């Protein structure tokens, strides 16, 4: 939407929401980001059940997917939502942030 | 505060206290009374406020300000006006 608009879903259970989530991501065609809001040390099974199914680039739990909360940043150590590209579009193409080795050519000389 | 009070009662007592307390120490009550040309005040308060936003305030201020409210406060203080809404 890229605008101050949002649509919601009515999920049934944890697994219903997971299924809708996976189906929802694939539409983007790029696995970039996804978010879980839940209780955190009563449910670890849920944590990584969800982590197991989801293939975005990056999973955040109980966190907004942006930069700048109180003080330093929320979250305060993370690459920006931009800067995440891939050499393929196709599907499940998990974005990787860019680095100078992607911009630099190699040499080894053997003696 | 009176022993039987509500919060806002105590609050107005508080800042009244500071009001004529700072009266006691012989200070102007509007920044125009402090001796400032106000035409340029209005002219340049605009960017004054924008840098006033991000000047490390940031800031344990419990509430966000936005550029608008700063400007209201600045004009009210310059005229000694009570910033109230």
3-state secondary structure string across B3-51: CCCCHHHHHHHHHHHHHHHHHHCCCCCCCCCCCCCHHHHHHHHHHHHHH
Say how many Å lie between the first and final Cα of chain A, rounded: 58
Eight-state DSSP code of residue A42: S
Distance between CA A53 and CA B48 in Å, rounded? 51
Q: Given phi > 0 = left and psi -120 to 50 = alpha, else beta, which region is A71?
A: left
Element holding A18 (H helix, E strand) = helix A14-28
How far are the Cα atoms of A4, A5, A6, A33 from residue A1, in angstroms, in the given order?
A: 8, 7, 7, 15
- A64 contacts A70 by C-beta, under 8 angstroms: no
- Give the C-alpha separation, A61 to B64, whole Å: 25
* Helices A45-53, A14-28: crossing angle, 10 deg rounding: 30
């Amino acid at each position: 939407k890229l605008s101050p608009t949002l649509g919601l879903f009515r999920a049934d259970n944890f697994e219903d929401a997971v299924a809708q989530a996976v189906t929802m991501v694939e539409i983007g065609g790029i696995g970039h980001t996804s978010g879980l809001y839940t209780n955190q040390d009563v449910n670890a099974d849920r944590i990584r059940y969800f982590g197991d199914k989801l293939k975005t680039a990056r999973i955040l739990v109980n966190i907004p997917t942006t930069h700048g909360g109180i003080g330093d940043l929320y979250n305060f150590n993370v690459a920006p939502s931009l800067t995440l590209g891939c050499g393929s579009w196709g599907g499940n193409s998990i974005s990787e942030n860019v680095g100078p080795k992607h911009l630099i050519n190699k040499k080894t000389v053997a003696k | 505060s009176q022993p039987g009070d509500r919060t806002a009662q105590k609050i107005e007592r508080l800042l009244t206290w500071l009001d004529e307390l700072k009266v006691n120490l012989d200070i102007p009550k509007s920044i125009q009374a402090a001796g400032v040309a106000e035409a340029d005040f209005l002219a340049k308060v605009d960017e004054l406020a924008v840098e006033a936003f991000d000047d490390q305030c940031t800031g344990a201020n419990p509430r966000y300000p936005l550029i608008a409210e700063l400007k209201e406060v600045l004009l009210a203080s310059y005229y000694g006006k009570p910033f109230v809404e």
